[PDB]
Design an enzyme around this catalytic site. Structure first.
Site, PDB file in Angstrom:
ATOM      1  N   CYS A   1      37.387 -44.068   9.366  1.00 54.63           N
ATOM      2  CA  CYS A   1      36.417 -43.807  10.445  1.00 54.63           C
ATOM      3  C   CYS A   1      35.185 -44.732  10.463  1.00 54.63           C
ATOM      4  CB  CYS A   1      35.949 -42.346  10.378  1.00 54.63           C
ATOM      5  SG  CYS A   1      36.949 -41.144  11.246  1.00 54.63           S
TER       6      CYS A   1
ATOM      7  N   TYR B  19      32.161 -43.099  12.778  1.00 52.61           N
ATOM      8  CA  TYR B  19      32.670 -43.203  14.165  1.00 52.61           C
ATOM      9  C   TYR B  19      31.772 -43.986  15.114  1.00 52.61           C
ATOM     10  CZ  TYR B  19      36.683 -39.880  13.646  1.00 52.61           C
ATOM     11  OH  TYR B  19      37.825 -39.248  13.253  1.00 52.61           O
TER      12      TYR B  19
ATOM     13  N   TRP C   1      29.787 -38.640  13.064  1.00 59.86           N
ATOM     14  CA  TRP C   1      30.964 -38.020  12.429  1.00 59.86           C
ATOM     15  C   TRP C   1      30.680 -37.667  10.971  1.00 59.86           C
ATOM     16  CZ3 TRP C   1      34.644 -39.425   8.517  1.00 59.86           C
ATOM     17  CH2 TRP C   1      35.802 -38.601   8.486  1.00 59.86           C
TER      18      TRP C   1
ATOM     19  N   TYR D 231      46.125 -40.377  18.903  1.00 62.13           N
ATOM     20  CA  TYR D 231      44.949 -40.449  18.037  1.00 62.13           C
ATOM     21  C   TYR D 231      45.252 -41.181  16.745  1.00 62.13           C
ATOM     22  CZ  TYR D 231      40.401 -39.045  16.158  1.00 62.13           C
ATOM     23  OH  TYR D 231      39.125 -39.115  15.680  1.00 62.13           O
ATOM     24  N   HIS D 232      44.351 -42.109  16.406  1.00 59.74           N
ATOM     25  CA  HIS D 232      44.413 -42.972  15.224  1.00 59.74           C
ATOM     26  C   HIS D 232      45.397 -44.129  15.337  1.00 59.74           C
ATOM     27  CE1 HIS D 232      42.377 -39.720  12.499  1.00 59.74           C
ATOM     28  NE2 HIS D 232      41.477 -40.526  13.031  1.00 59.74           N
TER      29      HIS D 232
ATOM     30  N   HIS E  78      40.217 -46.294  16.257  1.00 63.27           N
ATOM     31  CA  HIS E  78      39.807 -45.251  17.200  1.00 63.27           C
ATOM     32  C   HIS E  78      39.545 -45.698  18.650  1.00 63.27           C
ATOM     33  CE1 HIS E  78      39.030 -43.509  13.215  1.00 63.27           C
ATOM     34  NE2 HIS E  78      38.936 -42.311  13.761  1.00 63.27           N
TER      35      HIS E  78
HETATM   36 CU   LIG Z   1      39.517 -40.321  13.260  1.00 61.38          CU
END
Ligand SMILES: [Cu+2]
Ligand code: NA
Length: 639
Positions: free
Chosen positions: A228, A272, A290, A495-496, A581
């Protein structure tokens, strides 16, 4: 745990042939249906035959194969876990061709997978190149081959997906190592998880396009679990990886030495956040709630020369906050940041309100107006992508995303933002009729010709769940202001997930997942080969070659003279990318104005403004009359 996109084929009339098999541990023992019995190569008797070890399957009839599973020995012993491997497909028996999947599996007892595009075949072959711990053996408890519901032949002219690159980790973060041409990837403290992390450790993996080898390395020297983070390639040619699981840390990846060196701690602990390389080679970052706490995290700047982070508290995060339902935890995440003229940084979104960020003194912020068009005011677009496809004309294409980070519907919203001078509100119009498919968590890259490749994502943002996936990628073509659907893939990329442009002009798309014991971890990547690399016959087109360059290192405003093997129509400079991301603040494209010196000798000037030509490593691509690009020549741009 993991994948496999299809249903298991019946193992009744299967004929299996092995290169080596012991007594009690036969070749047929891998298809019996028991998890306690296993196939094992020669040990003790006939010595210890070193790998490659082959496992060929004859399914007797033609099946629409889209994957395979390999369950290792469950007796608690490590002898035989497959490391490096290759999966082949055939219809006759001895005409295998190129692998449909290749790579390396992690060193554990969990079920491993090779997921690839649907291709009708009768024969399947798993070649175990190495053993996970370098031992001479190979052992498989259970091997299954999967099939899709049907096969639909890929449409000519819409590109091609394949092969699959099998990885030991889920590549939630990635970067191209410019000096070597390898893809650097990273997960967290573990290969599939981040929750319950003690910190100080990152599992990295790399893939070399020229060799096909996947290797792994445990990074502890930087005392940073790099999951992240904010990612940026600075002017000194080092990748600045900031925060995440270890919120205050900075890690520097040096491409020339293939090593990680400790960087200074950030002034504010973040996770993030998006970071962006500036005109002077420095790195600006803002937001990121985050990790490290949930409060107003204003801007800060990294100086590569002094190796310091300095707070810019007046470069306020407040005007860039989205109206996210989860609040500040998400509202300051993944800013669409672009380094621009005179040390400024443009924030294109995800928030409706766009802003100019200034880095002189203690920083500043000025409203750049709302992202809009004649269709109305663009809503907040968290996880929407932003790509600078023409840096000379300040053109940014924005698309997709959802109002909230999760539990929110994605949109087809797309805009073209045209940057002028810092402090002026840019013109914003709608891009064609928007995206074909509503997507969030999708990824994108700018291609040599100015087109933007858009792939993966889902219609409704649900992290760690492969629901409502978009399998059909899209390409935006600026000269025509039109989106075009490309050939679909078989692996969900939500996601990711990540996408990066490779030096050979192909796209590397991978990741998705990273949740532990979940069924949605994608320990792989796939290659997308665009239509510009194919001829009218459907075969790989002849590519123009850059035979000579005057220099590999150039300052902004400087000239480069090149020689080619055939006539060139267009040329471009593409900055090497980094991704995590949905964020890629490093990529951008510069269309080159060519001077024809004759005799296939051409000259061009790198833009004088370092805000357009961001310092770092760039890819030089030349295109012929048919639109076919060359492989990239790595150019280093300095001030
Ligand atoms: Cu993540
Ligand atoms: Na078995």
């Amino acid at each position: 745990a993991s994948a496999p996109i299809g249903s298991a084929i019946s193992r009744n009339n299967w004929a299996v042939t092995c290169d080596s098999a012991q007594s009690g541990n036969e070749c047929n023992k891998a298809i019996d249906g028991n998890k306690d019995t296993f196939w094992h190569t020669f040990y003790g008797a006939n010595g210890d035959p070193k790998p490659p070890h082959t496992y060929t399957i004859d399914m007797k009839t033609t099946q629409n194969v889209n994957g395979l599973s390999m369950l290792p020995r469950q007796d608690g012993n490590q002898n035989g876990w497959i490391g490096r491997h290759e999966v082949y497909l055939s219809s006759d028996g001895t005409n295998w061709g190129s692998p449909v999947a290749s790579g390396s599996w992690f060193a554990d007892s969990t079920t491993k997978y090779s997921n690839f595009e649907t291709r009708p075949a009768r024969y399947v072959r798993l070649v175990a190149i190495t053993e996970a711990n370098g031992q001479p053996w190979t052992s498989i408890a259970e091997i299954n081959v999967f099939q899709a519901s049907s096969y639909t032949a890929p449409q000519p002219g819409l590109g091609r997906w394949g092969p699959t690159i099998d990885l030991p980790i889920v590549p939630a973060a990635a970067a191209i190592e410019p000096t070597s041409g390898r893809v650097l990837m990273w997960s967290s403290y573990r290969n599939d998880a981040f929750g319950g992390s003690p910190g100080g450790i990152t599992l990295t993996s790399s893939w070399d396009p020229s060799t096909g080898i996947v290797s792994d390395r445990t990074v502890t020297v930087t005392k940073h679990d790099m999951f992240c983070p904010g990612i940026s390639m600075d002017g000194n040619g080092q990748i600045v990886v900031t925060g995440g699981n270890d919120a205050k840390k900075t890690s520097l990846y040096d491409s020339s030495s293939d090593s990680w060196i400790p960087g200074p701690d950030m002034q504010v602990a973040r996770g993030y956040q998006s970071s962006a390389t500036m005109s002077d080679g420095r790195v600006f970052t803002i937001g990121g709630s985050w990790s490290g706490g949930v409060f107003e995290k204003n801007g800060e700047v990294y100086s590569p020369s002094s190796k310091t982070w300095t707070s810019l508290p007046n470069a306020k995060v407040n005007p860039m906050l989205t109206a996210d339902k989860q609040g500040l935890y998400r509202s300051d995440n993944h800013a669409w940041l672009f380094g621009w003229k005179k040390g400024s940084v443009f924030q294109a979104g995800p928030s409706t309100a766009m802003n100019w960020y200034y880095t002189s003194g203690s920083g500043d912020v000025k409203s750049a107006g709302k992202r809009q068009s004649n269709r109305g005011v663009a809503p907040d677009a968290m996880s929407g992508n932003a790509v600078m496809y023409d840096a000379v004309k300040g053109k940014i294409l924005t698309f997709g995303g959802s109002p909230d980070y999760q539990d929110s519907d994605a949109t087809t919203n797309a805009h073209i933002i045209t940057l002028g001078e810092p402090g002026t509100s840019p013109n914003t119009v709608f891009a064609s009729n928007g995206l074909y498919f509503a997507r969030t968590f999708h990824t994108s890259v700018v291609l040599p010709d100015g087109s933007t490749f858009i792939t993966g994502g889902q219609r409704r943002g649900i992290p760690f769940e492969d629901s409502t996936p978009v399998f059909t990628p899209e390409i935006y073509v600026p000269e025509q202001d039109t989106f075009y659907k490309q050939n679909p893939n078989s692996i969900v990329r939500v996601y990711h997930s990540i996408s990066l442009l490779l030096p050979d002009g192909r796209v590397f798309n991978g990741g998705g997942g990273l949740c532990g014991d979940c069924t949605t971890n994608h320990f792989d990547a796939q290659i997308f080969t665009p239509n510009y690399l194919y001829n009218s016959n459907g075969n790989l087109a002849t590519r123009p070659k850059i035979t000579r360059t005057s220099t590999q290192s150039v300052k902004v405003g400087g000239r480069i003279t090149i020689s080619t093997d055939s006539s060139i129509s267009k040329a471009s400079l593409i900055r090497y990318g980094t991704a995590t991301h949905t964020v890629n603040t490093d990529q951008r494209r510069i269309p080159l104005t060519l001077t024809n010196n004759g005799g296939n000798s051409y000259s061009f000037q790198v833009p004088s403004d370092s805000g357009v030509a961001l310092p770092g490593y760039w890819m030089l691509f030349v295109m012929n009359s048919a639109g076919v690009p060359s492989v990239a020549s790595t150019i280093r741009v300095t001030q």
